[PDB]
């Protein structure tokens, strides 16, 4: 019936995206209740970024240097404070669209939807994974700062990502909605680089299960393996060590398919050693690791 | 800055999705103005599908056999007519959320966003391409019939797909919003199969340009080629013949990058012959063809 990388419906967030401008810089903000959250480097000029003292830079700021637009509407800024690396800009109008929302700090390996915007206008929506080195591989051009990642869990909108940075290597980085960077990064134009990316093993397994469910099963073998033995082959190819809790987490998927986690770990073992010999798994010739077990169970059940 | 397969923000459509039930069957519908569009096979039982006479089946229908819910709300059905392969069910309440909308019949090779729903509830959003054989490769489980594909062009919401069918081969099929099937398919449980899928050449080129823009350029060569010569290698690998209009269409992309279409056709020529030798292009080890030139220019500019 198909398996696709898909994003939560984005309506509940489209209505929270506004435009923020300070000096010659314009980017995006998040309008919840009477507050608009955005990245604090909005107040920085080209020269400031090299070594900005944000507290000092912010004092010199008066509310009229901050210009906020809900679509074409304009919002009145009546205060501005800093929380870690995010600008809180209080406004008169509470957003009548504010949804039921949380501010969550996700875990590496977890996934969220990103609503990409340019000048307060939503552009599109896509799913990203928080890599083990606290980066994400998304689509953030000029004017994309302020786009936020989120999950929808039944009632609630869980905001987990606000985009700040791009790294020399093409990957991305940001903060939670309290303003704390994921990873070691700083909002400063100085040398910093990601750690080594390893690969999210439990997700790859989840992806193979998803593929068995959808008819791709050529990679299934009769072998079985032990965690320690597989995890020795894992370590060779920069794969996250698998754990018993990961196996527990994969329970429902192994059940729906009739394949022990450990039987699939042997199938995975063979694919790291020998590659794919020109066959495909769910339309890839590479192994994929940005699907969580939950993401798969949601779509395959 | 990144290139990702992304879908239009889905808010303007989330609010048009309702639940439809007839007998023991429940699926999705599209509530625009005072009308709810859904697939007409909703009125068919297991036995009917084999050879349904829909006109006859529909006469035996009274409005009370049709049950429609906007969320938990219920809508009153005050009429029901058939238009090709879609049920039009008039209702008392005009949707106060009805957007500015068109009903467009897209062209093979063109792309649209699909808002997947299950029992009137939106589940997620993703981008699909109308294959040259009038199928799509999406994610449509039980209760997904009625999910619609759409594009957003500035003001308007262009509805182009409503999902009806799944094919023995795992691929999907449906109608425009006037109820005309794409492809040769019929809403009947009898033998029918897709034509041979060829590959959308102009899209693959667009994808290579997107990859050059984002730093992947190992596949660039010094050679050049002629359309007829490339299109001879195209025909070998079930690739759509390239045309001068496709080259015109790729103009802006070839401009942004400095690579003549024909210089890229030679790079593509080499990749069909020799494959990728274990390198990747925008995180694939395969060539991709579900990006239009427009889809790329939108994200890379
Ligand atoms: C967001 N709206 N925005 C604009 C933007 C610039 C370049 C690209 Cl490719 C896409 C969008 N961004 C990403 C920025 O304004 C940030 C601000 C910033 C944050 C931290 C340090 C410096 C600047 N610009 C950057 O991410 C820049 N990154 C860096 O200079 C560094 C990365 C690691 C160490 S320094 C650039 C290089 C993307 C301009
Ligand atoms: C939509 N809500 N819905 C349910 C559904 C069934 C199976 C799967 Cl895998 C996913 C969802 N669908 C797809 C249907 O109800 C259709 C209705 C239909 C339309 C045309 C012909 C027959 C039935 N079910 C199907 O698509 C079925 N397809 C076929 O029988 C044929 C395909 C080609 C020739 S006959 C099945 C096989 C998916 C049940």
From Swiss-Prot, chains A, B:
Protein origin, superkingdom: Viruses
Describe the location of the Peptidase C30 domain by residue ranges. 1-301
Q: Describe how its activity is regulated.
A: Inhibited by pyridone-containing alpha-ketoamides compounds 13a and 13b. In turn, alpha-ketoamide 13b (tert-butyl (1-((S)-1-(((S)-4-(benzylamino)-3,4-dioxo-1-((S)-2-oxopyrrolidin-3-yl)butan-2-yl)amino)-3-cyclopropyl-1-oxopropan-2-yl)-2-oxo-1,2-dihydropyridin-3-yl)carbamate) inhibits SARS-CoV-2 replication in human lung cells. Inhibited ex vivo by michael acceptor inhibitor N3. Inhibited ex vivo by compound 11a and 11b.
Where is the protein situated, by its record's location annotation?
Host cytoplasm; Host Golgi apparatus; Host nucleus
**Which chain positions lie within coiled-coil regions?**
none
The UniProt entry annotates the active site at 41 (for 3cl-pro activity), 145 (nucleophile)
User: How is the quaternary structure described?
Assistant: 3CL-PRO exists as monomer and homodimer. Only the homodimer shows catalytic activity. Interacts with host FBXO22; this interaction promotes the proteasomal degradation of nsp5.
Q: Relate the protein's function as given in its record.
A: Cleaves the C-terminus of replicase polyprotein at 11 sites. Recognizes substrates containing the core sequence [ILMVF]-Q-|-[SGACN]. Cleaves and inactivates human TRMT1, preventing tRNA guanine(26)-dimethylation of tRNAs. May cleave human NLRP1 in lung epithelial cells, thereby activating the NLRP1 inflammasome pathway. May cleave human GSDMD, triggering alternative GSDME-mediated epithelial cell death upon activation of the NLRP1 inflammasome, which may enhance the release interleukins 1B, 6, 16 and 18. Also able to bind an ADP-ribose-1''-phosphate (ADRP).
Q: What is this protein called?
A: 3C-like proteinase nsp5
Organism of provenance: Severe acute respiratory syndrome coronavirus 2 (2019-nCoV)
Which gene carries the instructions for this protein? rep
Portion of the full-length sequence here: 3264 to 3564 of 7096
């Amino acid at each position: 019936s198909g398996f696709r990388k898909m994003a939560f419906p984005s309506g509940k967030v489209e209505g929270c995206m506004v435009q923020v401008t300070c000096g010659t810089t314009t980017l995006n903000g998040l309008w919840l209740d009477d507050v608009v959250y955005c990245p604090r480097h909005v107040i920085c000029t080209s020269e400031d970024m090299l070594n900005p003292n944000y507290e000092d830079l912010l004092i010199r700021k008066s509310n009229h240097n901050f210009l906020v637009q809900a679509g074409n509407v304009q919002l009145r800024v009546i205060g501005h404070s800093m929380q870690n690396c995010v600008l809180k800009l209080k406004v008169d109008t509470a957003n009548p669209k504010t949804p039921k929302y949380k501010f969550v700090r996700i875990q590496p390996g977890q996934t969220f939807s990103v609503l990409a915007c340019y000048n307060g206008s939503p552009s599109g929506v896509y799913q990203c994974a928080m890599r083990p080195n606290f980066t994400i591989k998304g689509s953030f051009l000029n004017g994309s700062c302020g786009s936020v990642g989120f999950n929808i869990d039944y009632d609630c909108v869980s905001f987990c990502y606000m985009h700040h940075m791009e790294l020399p290597t093409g990957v991305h980085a940001g903060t939670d909605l309290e303003g704390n960077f994921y990873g070691p990064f700083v909002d400063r134009q100085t040398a910093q680089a990601a750690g080594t990316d390893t690969t999210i093993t439990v997700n790859v397994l989840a992806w193979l299960y998803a593929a068995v469910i959808n008819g791709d099963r050529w990679f299934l073998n009769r072998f079985t393996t032990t965690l320690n033995d597989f995890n020795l082959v894992a370590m060779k190819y920069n794969y996250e060590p698998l754990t018993q809790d990961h196996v527990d987490i994969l329970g429902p998927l192994s059940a729906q398919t009739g394949i022990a986690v450990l039987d699939m770990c042997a199938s995975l073992k063979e694919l790291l050693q020998n590659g794919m010999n020109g066959r495909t798994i769910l339309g890839s010739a590479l192994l994929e690791d940005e699907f969580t077990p939950f993401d798969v169970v949601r779509q395959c059940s």
